[PDB]
Structure formats: structure tokens, C-alpha cells
Design a protein around this nucleic acid. Structure first.
Lengths: 101, 149, 126, 49, 154, 82, 211, 85
RNA sequence: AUCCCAGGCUGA
RNA sequence: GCUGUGAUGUUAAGGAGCAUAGGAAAUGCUACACACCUUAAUUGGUAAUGCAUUGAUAAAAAAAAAAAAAAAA
RNA sequence: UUUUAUGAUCCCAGGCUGGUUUAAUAAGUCAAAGUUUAGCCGGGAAG
RNA sequence: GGCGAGAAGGGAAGUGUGUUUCAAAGAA
RNA sequence: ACAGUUACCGUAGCUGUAGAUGAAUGCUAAUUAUAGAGUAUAUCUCCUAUGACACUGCAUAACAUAUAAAUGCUCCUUCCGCCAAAAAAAA
């Protein structure tokens, strides 16, 4: 039990143990491979509309894809989102991980 | 966010306090008749050895003190701090004041292997041949493994 | 590991004095618009880029609950593609298939001493 | 398996000492003896692949 | 030296080694694990980038990234390394575990401390089970008067 | 092919071993003035390097040669016996 | 005033040298270059043997005397070398046994580097030494220079200071130049089968040492 | 260079090109480079005389013929403009 | 040419 | 016995301080890391190095109980 | 006989190279040439 | 006695420096 | 890539505005946040909640990549770092 009546006591409690001024002390910041330098954020009304991540899938193959078991598999649209993958695409991704190689 | 940081730091503080208590309780005592000043004299601190001993209230404090505390000590130089650290570690590891090659051999000579100096039987010969077949004597040094097996 | 070291804490009323704030809501007080783009890249981005390939945080390691040893089944790898494009019609031919090596006139693989090119994997960007 | 398992540490502990060496060195030399072995193992695998 | 690895050996600079170059900025420092020659500048000429090592990271756990196949290849080639790199490779499992500073034989007080710590951990687990039998998030305990206590289990 | 030892030579040592030594006489660039300009205050600006055994002497001053240098190297000289 | 290297001098038994007009081969463009042959003059160092030790000794003829020529044989224990010790011994020290202590070497006591970290720690606390018995002796510059040969073996020191007990515990080499004869603290013991004619017993002291 | 120091060799008032009328406060100043150039004195009032040191920056006074530099106020012997807010 | 060599070999 | 002689020729291609010119071109450290040199040895050592001040010319200074992960819908 | 308007003869001035992010259907390598820890190189002398 | 030691060089050089493409074996 | 340049159209320059510097100058700040309420007076209002609603960039605060021009005078450099396994402390 400890009472932090002021900010000095809170700082004393939260302070890390002393470390030498020759070793790495500050953690290296995270860098996300899609916003390495800017961090866009919204700056224009509406400030809180819903933003959905979309990653294009396009056409990974342009050749006739036979059906896996019974599912068609062959593509039917260009608008498929890779962050919201459909049933048959997930089925293909699972079959690839099970291929014997 | 602040609460999560606070609780994690509280957990770490409790852990560190327990660890410090255990280390201080299980510190290795000095030999009979030695004090902090005696240890400083034996290590030959020289300058302000009595003052350093006065700063360090007990052998447990001296043994478990950190480099930060040693630096905080008034009048202690970098060389003196390094000397103290080295000798404290050597004593805790039992390589000092018995600092002699004969002492090292006497204290830390490995005991003989279980089957060392035993006459060879047919079972031993068969096991040795099986180990040789398994380890392909032609490659490298099979004996490193076969001797331990 | 956190639950293995799990501990029961005793939090009093005076220990939450600074866990609470004056403001009801939180928002970012500064925009993320960089005043000098090249200076920002040189000072705060480039020095931490020890490789030119873009790699995501790894998936967490799964440990058996009872023992704590790694599980035989682990999460799949998480690759990153710029703008979500995960294919190339004409991939460039790469020497890093046998890194730091070449083929001598005799027909054998031999080592090569050469300062690595820091931007080799970002040409083209992947 | 032997080199990277718990047998190497036990072999280091069981290495015999020679007069004039500290306990660490006698384990270091045995430890380096295992190192020369693992280096040879890596070379064989790399060459076969 | 086998004929393959001759280029890795420098007449002017020395034999190959596995070591660490400082990287980052003032304050925020990590290390790039590279294969270079002995007399090359630490942050200068090198032959390959084998990984990275960050002791201070936001997650609080030292991070070690390594190309395992490349580390094996350079060990086979004969690159030398120092105690810290040997220890990191031993922890990573790439090489057998090097002995501690004063040797394995010299550690008995530390084994006793480890055993005592394990026993105390088991005792605290038993106490936590006894607590689980009731699991009261909020309690009142006397000083004069009773104050509230929150039993957070982090 | 390049040379393993370059411009240095393996030569016997006073302790029974061997070591690498630079060539003699020194390979100098005489087309340029000595640097620093005050080098004469401490050195002999016209120092000469002779090759004499008993009564036989050789006049040999290494100098740069036209490219390609190849295995022979950048430096050469004439055969002059006294 | 400043402390600087003493001027170079030539050794006893040699002609003079002309010298050089600047300290070393890089002066002054590389001020931190140190020559391997530089004289060791700082405290805690031993001057090189036959290069900077035993300099030519000159004194005004007013103060010259016969004792002036016994300086090398009268050098103190820490400085006197094996040849200087041997010159004024029976049979030039031959047939006797010699061993060096090394506990009083100048570097172990004086200098800035005297106190430094050691791989084993600081000192807190019978011995098997190396014993040399000369057999062939020839002085090139009496008494400090000689070409000696003899038997090197492993002895057995003991409590008297220490005294040699078994000069031949292990047979070593039967003919070798003395080890560390260039300088150090040497002690000697006459052979067991000593003759009173050669090893003269001390003359009896006067009963009444009148002033 | 961003600006150069100079010595005022002449201080006078010149007539601006028409249709503008009035008097513009100008000085011929010998820069540190040795060149002599015409410099306008911006602001109301000044104390510059001959042999006065002034810091000179790039600034073109379109009225005065050939004037291509101005004087930095408050630096060297050129006091800042008074009654300015 | 004989100052040095903790460098060597030789002499019926 | 009485001057002297015995290798007795020592400081810039560097650093620091102070001035000159110029709009202007530079300051502190007890520095537990890396790297390097050395060694029989995590045996010993450093100031290359690493930290901090100013500079105003760059960032971070929003969001996830039990996790350190999570395009945070 | 050898060079020479594809610049001989013949002055003055300058070592070269790399640096990941990088908005706009301007990119899959920053796109004729702009860098910042670094890479390669840069005589000899105690006569 | 043994190893290491350039205040980490910009003082030379224009068809030069460097760059790009190659090549380099002891135990014969 | 937009605007302006005295009737209109075409040449043609010129003027302001972007970006990369971060080098000099002007004005300006700095030791970074001490402290912790209740009835904050009214109106309105089924997320009923000190909700609408309204001093806390206010915190474990942070503080970064490349550099070191020219002339003169004075002083300084001489015991550089390790190894005695450079035969040492020596069963």
C-alpha cells in the first residue's frame, strides 16, 4: 500500500531502476511497413466515419482453375478484398498448406 | 493504459523485492574473524579503505551492493570499484582468497566418470561397437561422444 | 509466462490517484504532417532500417499450457505486400539465391568479398 | 542432438583439469572441442545440400 | 582454410568474424549482427548481414533475429566470435551452450538460490489456489477504520 | 593472377623465424617535391640507396612503368653493374 | 623542470658512438611512435642488457681509486646479476648451486603499473625452484659479462629466507646458459663436498675489537 | 552570402524615378569584399553617416535606379526604427 | 677490417 | 688530487590556447554497451567509442484489462 | 615515321562511389545529373 | 623479450581517381 | 500551375505562389506544468450516468542523421596498450 498524494511520489514509484549511461536504454520504435514515415490520420470532416481496410486481390491466376472437390474456385469478380477473404479462397489457401511438395 | 502500466510495474517491484530478499539472506559469509574493513585491507584498497568500510554497514550490503551504490560511495574511484567487484565475485564463487592453482585443482577437480577405470567385459565391448557403428568413426572424432556414452 | 509469474496485488484508494485524469476524452494533440520530409527520413527513419525488406511483427509463439514447451503446430507466417499486390509478371533474377557466392571458371562455388548493397531488396519494392 | 542437448554441459562439467588452469578454462577447452565438432557438422550438411 | 572460403580471408584486414555493429541513433541503440574481417571498422565494411539484436525493446524482452542457415554457413566457413556472440548463439540453439563466467563447477550457491525460488513459486501458486476458492474482487481491512482493498490478479 | 604477398617479401628473422618486409631500395615518387616543405630540416633530401657487395655495386632506382602492370607490377629499373 | 629520457651512452668495453640528431625515425611528425630499442629509464623498468646497462664510467682523477673498479661486483642484491655474483666466488662460483628469487624485481614494487589487476586476485598468503650449477665459465667483460654453461635441474627450497636442500630432485639439462642471468636476485650455495682450502672459513673475529 | 558588412562611403537622399516623387534615403557602401554598392535605408529616419558600419542584405528598391541591397535595422551602427509597433 | 654478436662451423 | 671530454644536434604533416579576417564555421563527461588490442583464459586495457548542453530549422506527446500480439469496426 | 577537328601539341580548376521512405493511377528500382555515419584509393627518407 | 600502434591522412594524380563486368590453389 | 502585365490576338520576358535546404539575421519561450473538486447556481434530457457540457498538448514526458574553413603567434608531444605463459605467488 502506497499513497501518491502528489506527482513526485507517483514518479518515484514508477521510475525504473537506474541504468548505466553506456548501454541501450530507450526502446527502438515500431515501424509499420505501410506508414513508415507519415501516419496519415484524418484531418477533415467527417472525423469519425467508418474506414475499412481494403487490400486488392485482383487475379492471382489467369488460367482455368478446376474445382476443389465441388466448390467452383474459379474467380468471378475483381472486387474481392484480401483482408476479408471469401470461403473458396480460404479453401485454396488451406489446400496449399496441405500440398505434399 | 496508465492502470496497465501501473499494475505491471507493481508486479515487477514485488518480484524484485522478493529476489533481493532471497539473495541477501543466502549471501555467502566471510571467513571467521573478517569484517568489511578486513576485506578491504586484504584486497588492498589503500586510499580511504576505512571510509569505504564505514559507508558499507555490513558484508551482506557490500556483497549485494550495485555499481550504482559503489559509485555513490564518496571517494571511491573507478579502479577501486572494479577491484571490489572482481574480488567480491571471486569470493562468492570460491576462487579467493584461495587463489592458487593447487587450490583450484583441490577444490574443483572433476570426479571420475562412472565407468572410469573398470575392466572391459563383453557387454562393454558390444556397446562400444554399437556406438561406433552409430557414430560413424570415420567422421570427425567419434570419441567425444563415445566416451560420454 | 505472465500467468506463470502471476501475483495477487493489493491496490488501495490512494494508489489510483494518478490513474485518473481531468479530461473525459482523449485525442491526438498534434497532426502527423512532417515539416521537412527528407530531414525526417534521415533523422528518424533511415537510421533504424538495418534491412530494406519490409517484415511484419511475427505471430506469437504458442506454448503447451501444461508444460510450456513450444507447440508442434504454430501460426503461419505473415508476409507483407505494398498496397496489397502479391504478384509480379516479371520477377527480377536475383544473386541472393546463393548469397556471398559466385561460380569460378573451374565450375565451383566460391566465396565473394563485397560490401552488401543496402537497397538490394527494395529494388523493386515488395 | 548430443552437442545441442544437455549432454554437452555435463561433459564440460566432467572435463578433467590440468595444473595451471582455472576451472573455467578447462571447461572452455572442452567447450571449444565440441565447437570444432559442430563446425564440421555444419560443413557436411551445407555441402550435401 | 578450404579453397571455397579463401576470399572470406583478407590479407590486409584479417580472418572473418561474426560480430555486431552499432546501429540506431543517440539513445536508441540496437546492433546489426554481421560477418566481417577482424580489422574492418565496426560500423564499416562487412560481408553479409546475419541478423539483429535489440536488448531494449518496448515488449521488455530482448529480441534476437538471425538467419539460421547463414549462421551455420559462416560457422562452417570458420568465422570467429567472442563470448557475447557465443552466448547469444547458445541461447538461440545454433551452437552448444558456452560455460558461464567462472565455469559450471563453480555454481552451487546459485543452484541453491534457484531451488529456493522454485519452492517459493510453488508456495505462491498454492496460496493463489486458496484465494481462487473465494475470489473476492473487493475487500475491507482495518487500519481505526476499514479501508477498501482491490485484489487485482496480474 | 594477383600475388598472395603483394609488394612485401618473406625474409628470415634474427630469431630463426620469418617475417614480411617492404622492398629495398624504397619505391619513391621523385617527380614531386618532398612533403612537408620543411622535410629537409629533419631528413636528408638527397638520400641515396645503394646495392653493393664487396667491390661490386648495382645502380637500381625503382620507377613507375607503363600499363598494363600485370604480375610484374608498377615499378622497374635497369641493369647497371659497377 | 621536466623529466626526459637520459642521454644515450655507450657500454663498457666498446668504442664511442656518433649518435643521431633526432630521437627516433619519425621525429617530430609522429610524436607517439615508440622504438623497440628505446632505453627503459622510467621507474619500475630494467635497462636492456649490454645496450643501456653498464654505461662507461668516468670520474675525475681526484676521486679515482681502486674501489672505483669494484662497482659492478658491489651492486646491491636486487641489481647484481649472476656473473657479477660469480666473479668473486671460489672457482668463479663453479661447482656451486644458484637460484633466483624474483621477489624483489624493480617492476614488482615501483612504477605506475606496479599495482594492477591480476588474473588471480591480491596476495593474502617450501618451494620447488630451478637450480643452475656452472661448469664452463669465460668472462668477456669482468665481472658483468660472461659465457657460462652448466647443469639446470629442479631443486627443493625450504625454511632457513630460504635454503636449498635437494639441488637435484629432477634432472633437467646438463649444459645450458644460466636462465635470467642478465639481472635479478640470485642466491648461491656451496657444494656438499666442499674443501676448506677453496671455500675458506671465516677468519676468527678479534676477541677485543679495540677502537 | 546571406548578408555582408560594409562601410558607408556616402550618405545622401536621391530622387525616385517618375511618376513617383520624394526623397529616398540611400548610401554608397563599401562591402567587406571591397566592392562599392548602393544601399537603401528602410524605415523612417536614420543616423548613418560616413565611416559607419552597416550589415547589408539583398533587397531591391524599385524606385531608386540601380539600388539592389538594403540595410538590416538594429545591427551595427544602424539603430532600429523608432516609434514602431 | 676487426668494435660487437645469448650467431655459427672448422684445424690429426 | 686542481678546465672540460665521453651517443649528450629533441618538437610538426598533429593537438591546445590567444589573436587576425569573415555574415558564419563548434562544448562537457566516473564512458557497466559494441568493437578492437592483449592473454592460457568474459586475463587485463581504451575514448576510436558512447552519453549530455546548446542549437530553436526532425520526431513522439490518440485509441486494446488480465499480452509483449491485434490495419484498434 | 608517330599523333591530330572522334580535339593531337598544350595552360588553370576540381578524388570517385552508395544511402532503404519518398503522396499524384509520376512507377516494380525516385527515373539525364542534387546525400549524410560508409566503400575504394591517396610516395619515400636516422645514411 | 613478444604482439598491436597513421590525432584514422584529401599533401600526388584528367583521361587520372573511382565505377561496371570478370578472374585469382595449396598438399603441384 | 494558377493568377497579373491598361482595346483585341500572337511572340516575349517580368511579378507572386510549391518543394529541397537549415547557412546568417530579427522578435519571441524555456527549465514544463505546482495543485486536486463535489454542489461548479440555469435549461434540457428513459446510453440515468456529477449525460448534454465545455481550464489539464498535464506524462513512465520527450529532446534526432550527416559536418569542425583560412592567416599569425605561443605552448605541448619524451613513462603508448596488454602479456612475467616476458622461468611466476611455484601441492
Amino acid at each position: 500500500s502506497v499513497s501518491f498524494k502528489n506527482r513526485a511520489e507517483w514518479r518515484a514509484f514508477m521510475r525504473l531502476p537506474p541504468k548505466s549511461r553506456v548501454e541501450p536504454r530507450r526502446p527502438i520504435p515500431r515501424i509499420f511497413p505501410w506508414r513508415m514515415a507519415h501516419n496519415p490520420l484524418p484531418r477533415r470532416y467527417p472525423l469519425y466515419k467508418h474506414r475499412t481496410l481494403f487490400l486488392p486481390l485482383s487475379l492471382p491466376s489467369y488460367s482455368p482453375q478446376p474445382a476443389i472437390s465441388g466448390v467452383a474456385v474459379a474467380p468471378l469478380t475483381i472486387t474481392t478484398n484480401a483482408a476479408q477473404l471469401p470461403r473458396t479462397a480460404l479453401l485454396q489457401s488451406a489446400v496449399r498448406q496441405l500440398r505434399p511438395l | 493504459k496508465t492502470f496497465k502500466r501501473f499494475i505491471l510495474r507493481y508486479k515487477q517491484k514485488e518480484e524484485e523485492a522478493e529476489d533481493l530478499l532471497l539473495k541477501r539472506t543466502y549471501t555467502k559469509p566471510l571467513p571467521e574473524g573478517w569484517t568489511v574493513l578486513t576485506f578491504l585491507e586484504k584486497i588492498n584498497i589503500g586510499e580511504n579503505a576505512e571510509d569505504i568500510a564505514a559507508a558499507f554497514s555490513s558484508w551482506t550490503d557490500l556483497a549485494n551492493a550495485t555499481i550504482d551504490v559503489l559509485q555513490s560511495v564518496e571517494g571511491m574511484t573507478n579502479q577501486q570499484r572494479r577491484l571490489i567487484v572482481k574480488h567480491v565475485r571471486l569470493y562468492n564463487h570460491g576462487l579467493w582468497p584461495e587463489n592458487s592453482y593447487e587450490d583450484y585443482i583441490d577444490k574443483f577437480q572433476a570426479p571420475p566418470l562412472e565407468n572410469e577405470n573398470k575392466e572391459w567385459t563383453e557387454a562393454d565391448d558390444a556397446r562400444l561397437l554399437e556406438l561406433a557403428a552409430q557414430y560413424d568413426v570415420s567422421f570427425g572424432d567419434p570419441w567425444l561422444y563415445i566416451s560420454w556414452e | 509466462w505472465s500467468q506463470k509469474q502471476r501475483r495477487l496485488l493489493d491496490v488501495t484508494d490512494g494508489m489510483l490517484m494518478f490513474c485518473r485524469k481531468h479530461t473525459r476524452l482523449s485525442f491526438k494533440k498534434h497532426h502527423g504532417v512532417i515539416r521537412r520530409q527528407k530531414t525526417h527520413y534521415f533523422s528518424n527513419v533511415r537510421p533504424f532500417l538495418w534491412r530494406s525488406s519490409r517484415v511484419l511483427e511475427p505471430p506469437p509463439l504458442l506454448l503447451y499450457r501444461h508444460s510450456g514447451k513450444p507447440a508442434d503446430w504454430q501460426l503461419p507466417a505473415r508476409p507483407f505486400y505494398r498496397q496489397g499486390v502479391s504478384g509480379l509478371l516479371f520477377p527480377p533474377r536475383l544473386r541472393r539465391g546463393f548469397p556471398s557466392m559466385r561460380v569460378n571458371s573451374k565450375g565451383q562455388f566460391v566465396g565473394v568479398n563485397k560490401m552488401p548493397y543496402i537497397a538490394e531488396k527494395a529494388q523493386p519494392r515488395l | 542432438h548430443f552437442l545441442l542437448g544437455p549432454a554437452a554441459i555435463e561433459q564440460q562439467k566432467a572435463a578433467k583439469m590440468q595444473r595451471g588452469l582455472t576451472p573455467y578454462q578447462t571447461e572452455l577447452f572442452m567447450w571449444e572441442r565440441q565447437m570444432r565438432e559442430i563446425r564440421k557438422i555444419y560443413r557436411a550438411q551445407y555441402l550435401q545440400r | 582454410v578450404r579453397h571455397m572460403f579463401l576470399p572470406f580471408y583478407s590479407k590486409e584486414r584479417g580472418p572473418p568474424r561474426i560480430r555486431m555493429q552499432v546501429a540506431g541513433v543517440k539513445g536508441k541503440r540496437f546492433y546489426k549482427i554481421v560477418a566481417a574481417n577482424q580489422r574492418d571498422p565496426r560500423d564499416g565494411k562487412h560481408m553479409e548481414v546475419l541478423g539483429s539484436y535489440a536488448p531494449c525493446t518496448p515488449s521488455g524482452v530482448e529480441e534476437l533475429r538471425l538467419r539460421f542457415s547463414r549462421i551455420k554457413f559462416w560457422l562452417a566457413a570458420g568465422a570467429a566470435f567472442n563470448s557475447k556472440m557465443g552466448g547469444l548463439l547458445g541461447n538461440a540453439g545454433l551452437v552448444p551452450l558456452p560455460p558461464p563466467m567462472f565455469g559450471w563447477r563453480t555454481k552451487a550457491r546459485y543452484t541453491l538460490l534457484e531451488s529456493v525460488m522454485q519452492k517459493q513459486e510453488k508456495l505462491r501458486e498454492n496460496q493463489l489456489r486458496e484465494y481462487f476458492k473465494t475470489a473476492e474482487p473487493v475487500v475491507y481491512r482495518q487500519v481505526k477504520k476499514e479501508e477498501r482493498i482491490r485484489k487485482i490478479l496480474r | 593472377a594477383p600475388s598472395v604477398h603483394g609488394d612485401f617479401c618473406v625474409v628470415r628473422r634474427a630469431d630463426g623465424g620469418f617475417h614480411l618486409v617492404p622492398p629495398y631500395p624504397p619505391r619513391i615518387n621523385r617527380t614531386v617535391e618532398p612533403y612537408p616543405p620543411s622535410a629537409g630540416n629533419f631528413y636528408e633530401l638527397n638520400r641515396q640507396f645503394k646495392l653493393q657487395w664487396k667491390n661490386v655495386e648495382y645502380q637500381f632506382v625503382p620507377k613507375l612503368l607503363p600499363r598494363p602492370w600485370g604480375r610484374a607490377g608498377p615499378w622497374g629499373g635497369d641493369l647497371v653493374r659497377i | 623542470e621536466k623529466e626526459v629520457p637520459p642521454p644515450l651512452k655507450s657500454g663498457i668495453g666498446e668504442p664511442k658512438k656518433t649518435g643521431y640528431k633526432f630521437p627516433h625515425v619519425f621525429f617530430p611528425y609522429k610524436s607517439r611512435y615508440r622504438s623497440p630499442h628505446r632505453q627503459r629509464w622510467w621507474p619500475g623498468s630494467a635497462p636492456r642488457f649490454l645496450l643501456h646497462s653498464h654505461p662507461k664510467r668516468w670520474a675525475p682523477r681526484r676521486d679515482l681509486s681502486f674501489a672505483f673498479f669494484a662497482f659492478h661486483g658491489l651492486k646491491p642484491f636486487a641489481e647484481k646479476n649472476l656473473y657479477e655474483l660469480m666473479h668473486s666466488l671460489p672457482l668463479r662460483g663453479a661447482s656451486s648451486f644458484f637460484w633466483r628469487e624474483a621477489d624483489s624485481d624493480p617492476w614488482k614494487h615501483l612504477g605506475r603499473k606496479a599495482n594492477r589487476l591480476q588474473a588471480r586476485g591480491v596476495r593474502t598468503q617450501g618451494r620447488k625452484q630451478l637450480v643452475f650449477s656452472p661448469r664452463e665459465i669465460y668472462y668477456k667483460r669482468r665481472p658483468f659479462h660472461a659465457l657460462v654453461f652448466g647443469r639446470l635441474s629442479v631443486g627443493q627450497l625450504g625454511a632457513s629466507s630460504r635454503v636449498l636442500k635437494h639441488p637435484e630432485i629432477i634432472r633437467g639439462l646438463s649444459r645450458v646458459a644460466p636462465p635470467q642471468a642478465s639481472l635479478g636476485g640470485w642466491k648461491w650455495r656451496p657444494p656438499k663436498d666442499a674443501s676448506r682450502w677453496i671455500f675458506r672459513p671465516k677468519f676468527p673475529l678479534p676477541f677485543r675489537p679495540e677502537l | 552570402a546571406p548578408q555582408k558588412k560594409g562601410i558607408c562611403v556616402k550618405v545622401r537622399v536621391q530622387t525616385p524615378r517618375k511618376p513617383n516623387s520624394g526623397l529616398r534615403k540611400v548610401a554608397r557602401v563599401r562591402l567587406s569584399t571591397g566592392r562599392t554598392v548602393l544601399v537603401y535605408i528602410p524605415g523612417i529616419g536614420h543616423n548613418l553617416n560616413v565611416h559607419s558600419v552597416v550589415l547589408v542584405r539583398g533587397g531591391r528598391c524599385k524606385d531608386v535606379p540601380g539600388c539592389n541591397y538594403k540595410a538590416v535595422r538594429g545591427v551595427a551602427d544602424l539603430l532600429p526604427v523608432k516609434n514602431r509597433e
